[PDB]
């Protein structure tokens, strides 16, 4: 042309996991080119692990995927961020939402070209099962196909009933999306709803929403231009350790919750309720259990819930 990790790999994974600050190192590794924007990288690093997934008989399956929406001024670097997270994840798809078929992300019964026969072809959400699916140009996605994502983010299954075939597939994926506003700037005075041109439920169901802002600041502008030119000037980042660590954490590790998380979580939610919907607490639990999967552990404690609440309240600050 053009898995089965060894014991030495296990040992090096353990000793690296024994690092004092594993959070910041892979915070900076995922996007070496991106300068600042450390908080969105924190969120993406937490997303790439995901909270534990469970399906008990009585209540049913409870989701364990984290959804993130990036939006803001039109000339930031969100697309490069998405193309960065595309490569790290094991199984994922990077397709823009500008056009294509209304079921282009799900199954589409099509006539076979080579033979006059019938073939069932899955879409991009089914093909990102168990991973992270990146959507680009979220604002151009059509009103009729949007509803498809609605059943994906709610029941995590897609049903097709055409040409005598009635069946259901499995989505179980995570949505990271990037959007653009109407106009050349996101004026803070007007609220989010008018600018982003997205239905309130669709924006609401996203676990984390980040606003990227671009203000004319002499310090920030000079610092950005400096490192950009330094990159153009010709003169702590692991290469593939991330993929193996991600696979190890996703395929073997399953954390649990203890009463130490109970005590902090209940009072934190109540204090946030001193307009936080019940979605907020299930968002904190997922983020805390995903942080617990990092700094390799088998149970949650105070540090994970503190980091989760800090992240979800810094999200509120914007």
């Amino acid at each position: 042309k053009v898995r089965q990790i060894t014991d030495q790999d296990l040992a090096k994974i353990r000793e690296v996991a024994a690092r004092e600050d594993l959070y910041s190192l892979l915070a900076r590794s995922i996007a070496p080119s991106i300068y600042e924007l450390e908080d969105v990288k924190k969120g993406i690093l937490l997303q790439l692990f995901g909270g534990t997934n469970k399906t008990f008989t009585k209540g049913g399956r409870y989701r364990g995927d984290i959804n993130i929406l990036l939006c803001g001024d039109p000339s930031t670097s969100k697309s490069q961020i998405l193309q960065y997270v595309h490569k790290i994840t094991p199984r994922g798809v990077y397709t823009s939402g500008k056009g294509s078929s209304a079921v282009g992300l799900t199954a589409y019964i099509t006539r076979d070209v080579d033979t006059k026969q019938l073939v069932l072809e899955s879409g991009a959400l089914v093909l990102s099962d168990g991973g992270v699916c990146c959507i680009d140009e979220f604002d151009k996605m059509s009103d009729s196909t949007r509803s498809v994502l609605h059943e994906v983010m709610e029941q995590q299954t897609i049903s097709i009933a055409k040409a005598g075939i009635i069946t259901t597939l499995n989505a179980r994926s995570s949505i990271l999306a990037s959007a653009n506003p109407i106009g050349s700037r996101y004026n803070p005075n007007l609220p989010v709803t008018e600018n982003i041109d997205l239905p309130p439920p669709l924006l609401s169901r996203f676990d984390l929403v980040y606003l990227v802002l671009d203000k004319v600041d002499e310090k920030n502008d000079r610092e950005l231009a400096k490192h950009l030119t330094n990159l153009y000037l010709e003169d702590v980042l692991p290469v593939e350790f991330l993929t193996m660590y991600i696979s190890y954490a996703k395929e073997h590790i399953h954390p649990i919750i203890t009463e130490a998380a109970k005590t902090e979580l209940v009072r934190a939610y109540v204090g946030m309720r001193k307009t936080a919907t019940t979605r907020q607490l299930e968002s904190m639990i997922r983020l805390a259990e995903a942080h617990a999967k990092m700094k390799l552990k088998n149970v949650v404690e105070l540090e994970d819930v503190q980091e989760a609440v800090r992240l979800i309240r810094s999200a509120i600050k914007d």
């Binding site: 006539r111 026969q117 075939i165 019940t278």
Partner: protein, 629 residues
């Protein structure tokens, strides 16, 4: 004539296995043969694990490797066993027998199919994507000589119409010109199904591989398109019979409508030399022949009491006895949510249902309960829909806006492989005799709101376009979830002003349930604590009086009853209707409200397992109607 020695050993070993296994001494296979004798069945089932312990696999591996050559001896031994132990199964009203193997140790994928397993016994898995008609296949042919009129019978056929050659008992010389006696010949059922690879076995970028599986005998129609099924049988190879000299001129030497691949022109290795072929070249392709198929992806009281076991029957009748049972049932519905007992009661009444009646004049009276639940966001309105769709049989889930062309009622589409107009199925159609759970009910299209004007009341869909005219059937109950207009409920405006539905549609909903959350320091603590008791203990967090199976059995048993109305119940009903009409003042209250009250009374009576209706039930139904208006 030359005979085989290994085949004889396999034949006697199979007879010994059938006669001697007896391990449970029960004579399990003799029990099966007795069951076939009493029930008049034509197929036997043999487990591989059962055979995997006799002779240390010497018989099992011999059968597996050369199933194709050993099947005739297995059937011959089965014939002797049947004759010895049950002669009645030797003749029909002879039964062509079938042997079904299952529980093989390892399963294969479609991409492991190589020519070196041709003739072997295998098991495969795949998703069905097409099925054909049940056609009759010619099994044992019978002919008559044109001149002698002599009768030949039992002329085996492999892959093409085969007539006999040398004439029967006289002097007559004849090589051809026979006449099939279609009446004397034996036939069998035949079906062809197309399968493809599963969603997980498909690589990251792949065009799915396909296969042709042949179902024969009693295995027809057991695989339906879209399902995931595990087949087991023998891998065979099928030649091209067209160039094998078919009798008729209809084949016309491979008439074609499309162009064959130039890439494989001369690359596909065809064998020549045979006299039947002539100068032609014979070609082969791999197909599968299946003998066993498995899938891996009545309101009559007397017949109902027969199926259940004695322990279940006693448990059910002890369950019925207690008078608190009703209060327990409303607690068993959706044990994974906090609060909203009225919603649970409404859902239970919907699932129990009402009686359907037909008048002598031919007009049908509705017996389906429709519920609408509204409220501000984050009130667990979408958890009830998931519970219902998971627990209620023949139930479907859908949203307001639909991507499909047949969004919610129906659409007319031309045939993909025919010359006619067909009809696709909407969510309402796919829920006949079931519950349809509609979410985001506000954003429906007007052409669908006008369309549902017939399904809710007349329970039919009637279309008339260029292609087809039909009167479809939608006898489905509707559970709808909606949000108030403007984002939040206002506690001084009515249901009408806050909602957007018109009076036609609003009057067709039996029950309205408005659920409201409140921001106070104490209830939020309880809700958060309850929701977080999960995720540590997945099973011990919730404890209902009855499990899912007991409730599912009780609902089915209760639906057998059909209550009637007493003398005082009618007077109480008319009095309550008159009072409600007086209180309304005719803008919101119509005859449909009285009919809905009758339906609710009948459902509440079905809840208590009583065949007579008491005015207390009408009072309860009246209170339920008043609570939503």
């Amino acid at each position: 004539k030359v005979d085989d020695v290994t085949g004889e050993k396999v034949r006697e070993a199979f007879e010994q296995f059938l006669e001697d296994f007896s391990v449970q001494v029960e004579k399990v296979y003799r029990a099966q043969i007795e069951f076939m004798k009493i029930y008049d069945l034509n197929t036997i089932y043999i487990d591989y694990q059962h055979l995997s312990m006799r002779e240390n696999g010497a018989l099992a591996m011999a059968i597996s490797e050369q199933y194709y050559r050993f099947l005739p001896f297995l059937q011959k031994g089965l014939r002797r066993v049947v004759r010895k132990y049950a002669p009645e199964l030797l003749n029909t009203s002879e039964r062509v027998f079938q042997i079904s193997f299952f529980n093989l140790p390892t399963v294969h994928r479609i991409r492991d199919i190589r020519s070196e397993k041709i003739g072997s016994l295998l098991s495969i898995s795949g998703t069905v994507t097409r099925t054909s008609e049940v056609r009759p296949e010619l099994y044992k042919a019978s002919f008559t000589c044109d001149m002698c009129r002599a009768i030949v019978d039992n002329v085996e056929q492999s892959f093409k119409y085969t007539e006999p050659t040398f004439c029967p008992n006289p002097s007559c010389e004849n090589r051809a010109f026979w006449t099939l006696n279609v009446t004397r010949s034996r036939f069998l059922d035949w079906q062809k199904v197309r399968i493809q690879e599963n969603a997980n076995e498909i690589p990251t970028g792949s065009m799915p591989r396909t296969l042709d599986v042949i179902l024969r005998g009693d295995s027809v129609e057991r695989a339906k398109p879209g399902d995931r099924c595990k087949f087991t049988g023998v891998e065979i190879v099928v030649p091209d019979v067209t160039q094998l000299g078919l009798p008729g001129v209809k084949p016309s030497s491979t008439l074609d409508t499309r162009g064959i691949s130039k890439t494989t022109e001369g690359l596909n290795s065809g064998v020549t030399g045979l006299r039947s072929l002539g100068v032609r070249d014979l070609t082969y392709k791999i197909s599968f022949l299946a003998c066993h198929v498995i899938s891996i992806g009545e309101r009559d009281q007397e017949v109902f009491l027969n199926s259940l076991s004695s322990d279940e029957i006693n448990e059910l009748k002890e369950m019925v006895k207690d008078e608190h049972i009703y209060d327990k049932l409303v607690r068993s519905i959706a044990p994974a949510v906090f609060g909203h007992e009225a919603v649970k009661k409404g859902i239970l009444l919907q699932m129990l249902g009402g009686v359907h009646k037909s008048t002598v004049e031919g007009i049908k009276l509705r017996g389906d309960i429709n519920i609408c639940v509204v409220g501000d966001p984050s009130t667990s309105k979408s958890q009830f829909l998931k519970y219902v769709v998971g627990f209620a049989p023949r139930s479907v889930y859908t949203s307001g806006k639909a991507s499909s062309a047949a969004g919610l009622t129906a659409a007319v589409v031309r045939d993909e492989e025919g010359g006619d107009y067909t009809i696709e199925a909407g969510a309402l159609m796919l829920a006949d005799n079931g519950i349809c759970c509609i979410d985001e009910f506000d954003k429906m299209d007007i052409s669908d709101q006008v369309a549902i004007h017939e399904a809710m009341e007349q329970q039919t869909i009637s279309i008339a376009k260029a292609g087809i005219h039909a009167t479809l059937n939608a006898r489905t109950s509707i559970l709808a979830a909606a949000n108030p207009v403007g984002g939040r409920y206002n506690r001084k405006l009515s249901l009408r002003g806050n909602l957007n539905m018109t009076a036609p549609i609003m009057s067709r909903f039996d029950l309205f349930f408005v659920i409201l959350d409140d921001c106070n320091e104490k209830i939020d603590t309880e809700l958060a604590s309850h929701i977080v008791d999960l995720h540590m203990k997945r099973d011990e967090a919730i404890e209902p009086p009855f499990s899912a199976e007991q409730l599912r059995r009780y609902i089915k048993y209760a639906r057998t009853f059909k209550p009637i109305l007493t003398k005082e119940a009618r007077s109480y009903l008319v009095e309550k209707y008159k009072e409600l009409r007086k209180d309304d003042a005719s803008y919101r209250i119509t005859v449909r409200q009285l009919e809905s009250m009758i339906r609710l009374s009948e459902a509440i009576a079905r809840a208590n397992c009583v065949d007579e209706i008491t005015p207390s039930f009408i009072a309860e139904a009246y209170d339920l109607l008043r609570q939503s208006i």
